[PDB]
Ligand binder design. Sequence first.
Ligand SMILES: CC(=O)N1c2ccc(-c3ccc(C(=O)O)cc3)cc2[C@H](Nc2ccc(Cl)cc2)C[C@@H]1C
Length: 109
Amino acid sequence: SEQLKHCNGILKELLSKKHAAYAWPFYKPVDASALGLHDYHDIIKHPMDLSTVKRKMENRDYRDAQEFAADVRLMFSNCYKYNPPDHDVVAMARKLQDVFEFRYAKMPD
Ligand SMILES: CC(=O)N1c2ccc(-c3ccc(C(=O)O)cc3)cc2[C@H](Nc2ccc(Cl)cc2)C[C@@H]1C
């Protein structure tokens, strides 16, 4: 769980105010009704968000670092899948993923 402690640190950073400018769309599940998005749940079969990830870390539902990484990347992929390349939210996901991947890359073994 030493690797997972470092994952928990990474999660904290993603959720900190420092990255709030581009992280906010990912705090919570996409609410398709509230946003008026009729086709979202058809196009995206495995929704993911930072709250779910946080919950799974807290309940210790991750077996390892790479399970955590798959969830974080799923979240970014859903966003890239669903939205157009020029959409602000795509620019925002890329900024956050930059933080994620760099930190994740800097984990020990
Ligand atoms: C993740 C993803 O791809 N999407 C997503 C998810 C959640 C929210 C969202 C979340 C919170 C609020 C709010 O609290 O007001 C509003 C919209 C918005 C979006 C995206 N919409 C959006 C994002 C950024 C900007 Cl600057 C303008 C529009 C679309 C997409 C479904």
